């Protein structure tokens, strides 16, 4: 058994998906320790893990899966696949329209096109396990591509993208060239680079050849490419992270806010401009020694900082984890979560119909399914509970959802989300009375968000 | 003549606009010193000025002109005039549908209807000059709203605006209370109130019987109302300005512009916000005591109060340059100015043919803008354009933005031009590195009605 | 006093406004017979007026006025003004952006750019009356353009129209090419032609220079072109009326009705398609003999005919008249009309304040409709209104469709008013069922300025 | 093997798709003969089968699968499930949001409530092939939906639908009632109604119990009702077909353009309506004499029943099919279809290499398309394409239209190929002046999987 079966196996018998993210991530990059990672080389050096076991992420995804996928599912070009290559320096893209059959997408692999599938998790319930639990402990989403390049060739143009990355060889070997921010503004780039030439670049801070089982991880605004060597073809597939995950992000958000807060609390916002400041502002008085100039732009420096005393950081953190659960993957259960969930609740049938399948009593312990399913939020003074489990796999295909939670149970609804994993009665639950304490538990139940101790039925 | 005809015909012997917009407001609130009023009055307290003289205002609009307009012009109910009264302590409206002529006008007025005129700039040529060179020394568009209120009656709820109000006492009389902000929230309004009931109201700080020639201003914030007591109506224009022109709204326009240079130029404000924030920053660990909320928040003021440092101020001050000349009413221009522009030039048709055709400024023409508060710079886009007010229609917003593009090689030009007025300056002197850019930026600006020159071109 | 004054003279003598359009109108053409004209010309032939008198339309429109539109109204290239000049066979447009200052556009013209005014009715009262007479008597929006070219020069390429033209010579003289129509598509053209080659063009069917009192007219689909000749400009006035008014047009918009009528009606038209009649129908299918073709082809046929019995001709006819009421130029009131009307309603000021207000009107009152084109009966949504014309802008479409709403109890009264113009019909004879009914109807409208009385109310 | 799996292993030996059509809609109505229910029952009558089999249906559908659905498959409820109950008359709705779980769904059963699946071809392939195969006949999309009634209870309140319902009994029994057309306006309606009160209904045409394997059919506008009695529940299949496929629906889209091409054919289409016509038609003249409303409206009359001849019937009956392809089912091939098609080529990866990869075709290959319903050429603007549901989504409307350009070098021969079905057709015996062409043509087919070869390539 591979270690990446042997390491699932493992994962189905922790309880705490909290654990399972951390115990996951610690095996993706296994020897090195995950607090070194986080704190000294995340967003700030390229990594090489090299493993000495061409087996270790078997089971995750091969050339015979991609196979299978474009046979079996409906898969798409453009949407679902794309075909390129990188010759003469020059970049190309021969993405015929429509479907992506077996038989058109392994002649353009013959014809020297590497294939790139933008979703694998759509369609590889390894693959989005993989990604579901990973992006748990990312606090941002996890997305991935896969790619196959065949022997003697380059699929991709140089440049650098807006995300964390993180590739894991998965087939054969492939000669990777990884630098360094070329810039200051580079470093951490915002946004993907266009195509580079090999003239734009400068010395390789990291060039190997990754073989099965490796990891390379790099952070945004590092300029990478990779070809295949001579006889053998590559399948990798990389995890990416960190989207617009910045302070600068954050503060766009609390800004506007703050202002609006500012003006309405403090007449020292409210106050007009000068009726003449137009006379010394503005491009044509870049160069005034009106003094007047002076204490103008000494004013708003001011004003800006007291703005950060409005900031309502609070319902900003919020609107984002909201935002995360939208974009976050649907949870994966193990047996005992399932089996004690309404995802494992059995149905009776007496004569043909349904007989009673059940129902939660006062006597009942129980705590939310997962630890990051679910986020309560504030908006128009009501309170809302968005959550992940009806989410579908391919990205935003579902709308947020959510369900109101009223002020009798909105102690009770922060206990359960902040003592997960911790059993806690219903009995005992923070409410007005023993039907606010019931009818939440039941409605939480019903929509697969809460477990129970002992299987109802 | 009356006051106002006199300081008008000051005005058209006034060479500077800037000269004459300060001069007009000195005479509004006289014998009150601008000084004095800007320092402390402005924008903090209701201010009322006793003219001891009933023919101050005589020229600027009376009954008779709206009769004249509503005969002449037409007035619709709804987007130019507006019928309403104050009864029973509600406020109802009365307007018909379509054109409002004399007749329904006035059967209105006798049943004890208030008559609103919302535009009178745009029928009225001594109010639209009045505006246009206040304006000038606002710094911010100066609109007007004409009230004709009949015996024995209020027209209006009282409620405070969310402009600064200067009203002018024109005809008549009326008793005026003035009421100060009632609650801290209130002082310097961003909105117009809903109508409030005599109960909603506390004491006034003001309380007055208008008389022909009197001024009464206050601030946006202040409630305010007013009934005509037994025996005449009145009538009464009140002029305003200022809407949304705070350090709040320039800063609105600010901040985005300065998180997007901050992200750009400065790598702390592009490095990612920590794995695990949403365990300690949420309403629902708004109490928590995780020493990483302390250090997130502190975080988050340190890059707010730096964010002072990327703000575009210069380019904010000229949107909203831009938008004031949008906002603005098309110039007035004197007996001089009209003679020495594009708009005295004698061509004209006579003999089936067009005479007076032979005049073209050249290197040695002196010339210089227009009037001071025109036209401005303005760069977007990597490009520069001067946007101007003197085809912008008497009607607010009637007109799009209008503006001409300025090359390059003829900025520094075009800003010794709208930096120098009222100097006049030789065309072959203007700042340009050839001889031609001169002569083209000079002849586009003149053909455009922007620039005068110092004797009238042959 | 000229022809063209005379006849404007008499008009306002004239009481019928029915009447004052069919006398301008054999005016325009005179001496030839409208009756000759509509019968055997209109949308036939071109046709050529010699007037033998210069002086016949002084008084319409001149170069002057366009110099003095320039310099007193706000005149905009593009929007009002066009500057264009035909040089080695292409159409050039050299329009400055903004404003059309006399300046700019004596300029254009002296470099050999014809002038094409395109509204002159909102600057000109006179071109205004014209047209405003006119279009009562052509049942369709008549619209204008003025052509003002200078010596040696052609403006415009040669192409043809989508209306039908009157060319009126105001000055100097011109020459005038008009052709027939092409091909047998072109003849009476849905659209406007691009602009045509030299070599695209066939033999004349009308040589001839025009001098002032002429008159040119010739139908949609016929290619014209004009050039002064030398050392004479030219003027002229183009009439156009006709836009997209033909019998296709009326079936573009009862057919839709009609077939939701039949469909809502007659089960026939709500059976289904045969299951297979894609194997037999279509492109790939037109050459076929299957039998089937001809039966489906037979059924298309005979529903289609069946039509006619559900097409609602009464309101698709009513919702044109709607169109042209929209598309109308406000009317121009005799003396008479306006002294009988609530226009003319005098208003008595007494201590400075109005007491005259409003007269009424009794059932013992006779009258009649302001004018008999400026409403029509509409029936909408269950509902009836009464489309005007009154409150419309010279400008065409500034204003929105006008309409006040006709209950079911004032509905006979009103079609009678409509239908009896200009006959006096007093108050109290009007067909209601009730006094207040006839009391109401005649107020609302006696307001409105759709109404007017046999003597002045007051 | 019941009835079902039997002639669906039947049919998967036919050859032809379009006699696989044929060949279910018999099974789907045994023993009646189609031809005698096409031609006097469809669309006139409601039908009753006793088959006296209820095995007939066994693999069509269960509430076992209705059971796996909800637990293995994302369905939403409002979106794929519907939830309702009628009772004391009024019909109601316990759709709770959010994904329809067991125990939710089976919840609202025990409640009362019965349970709807909206599209069930989504999520289960024989529904799928079945309505795949059946929609070829009907020359209309086919659709479904599943209907589970829980005992002593009934779901729906009485109405009529806008299309063609075939019911299929599956499990249990269930009391129907169905009603003739209630007037002549509601036979064939256009659009379902609304929930009916039982006041509001007469007397049933057929009042019957229906047991598995029975079929119920009845034309759009009979309302009909159903309810489970005693300890028995009910599962039923409905078939629609026949949604706004009418001769009303075909002369909508027929008309605007016959009229337009009429206005450009024939000049009369194209000549001026008259200047007076407004004088004697519509609403106000209603009771005109004037003859010449008389002669207006027979003209209408004629110039209605001639654009019949102005038709392009064949472009609109291609549109219809356009449309038809896309609303269409992906194809169900069959085994034989499938290994002589692209998409049973065997080119699968072996020892790290595509294997097996680059079988073409050659000017001595037969082929013929690979189904009869799965193609459509249609010409627009000028130009060749060729339409597909090959591609399309088993959920409605979920995949965009999908076409590719056909080149003229090439069109015969690709109608050759629409009209040659079953029968091969040797490459190189395409009409096309160039063998390039045939091979292009034939290779472009392939790859699309639209057509299939008589020796499998691989």
Known sequence: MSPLRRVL??????????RR?????????????????????????????????????????????????????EVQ???????????????????????????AAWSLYQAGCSLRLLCPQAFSTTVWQFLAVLQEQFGSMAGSNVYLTPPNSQGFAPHYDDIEAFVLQLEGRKLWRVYRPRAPTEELALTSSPNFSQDDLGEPVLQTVLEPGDLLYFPRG????????????????????????????????????????????????RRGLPRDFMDYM??????????????????VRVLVARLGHFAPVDAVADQRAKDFI????????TDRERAL??????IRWEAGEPVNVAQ??????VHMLQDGIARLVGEGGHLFLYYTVENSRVYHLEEPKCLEIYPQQADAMELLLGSYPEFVRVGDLPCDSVEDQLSLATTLYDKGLLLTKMPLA
């Open 21 to 73: 993210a951390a115990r996951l991530f610690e095996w993706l990059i296994a020897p090195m320790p995950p607090d070194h990672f986080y704190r000294r080389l995340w967003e700030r050096e390229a990594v090489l893990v090299r493993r000495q076991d061409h087996t270790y992420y078997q089971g995750l995804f091969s050339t015979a899966d991609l196979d299978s996928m474009l046979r079996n599912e």
């Open 360 to 365: 939660l009593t006062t006597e009942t312990e």
């Open 341 to 346: 969930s309404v995802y494992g609740l059995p």
């Open 326 to 333: 939208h974009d976050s993957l649907p949870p994966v259960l």
């Open 282 to 299: 503005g491009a044509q008085h870049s160069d005034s020694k009106d003094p007047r100039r002076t204490a103008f732009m000494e004013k």
């Open 77 to 103: 070009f453009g949407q679902h696949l794309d075909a390129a290559r990188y010759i003469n320096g020059r970049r190309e893209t021969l993405n015929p329209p429509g479907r992506a059959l077996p038989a």
């Open 9 to 18: 196996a493992e994962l189905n018998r922790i309880p705490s998906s909290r």
């Open 222 to 269: 590092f300029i990478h490419q990779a070809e295949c060597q001579d006889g053998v073809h590559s399948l990798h597939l990389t995890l990416s992270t960190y989207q617009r995950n910045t302070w600068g992000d954050f503060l766009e958000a609390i800004l506007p806010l703050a202002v609006q807060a500012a003006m309405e609390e403090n007449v020292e916002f």
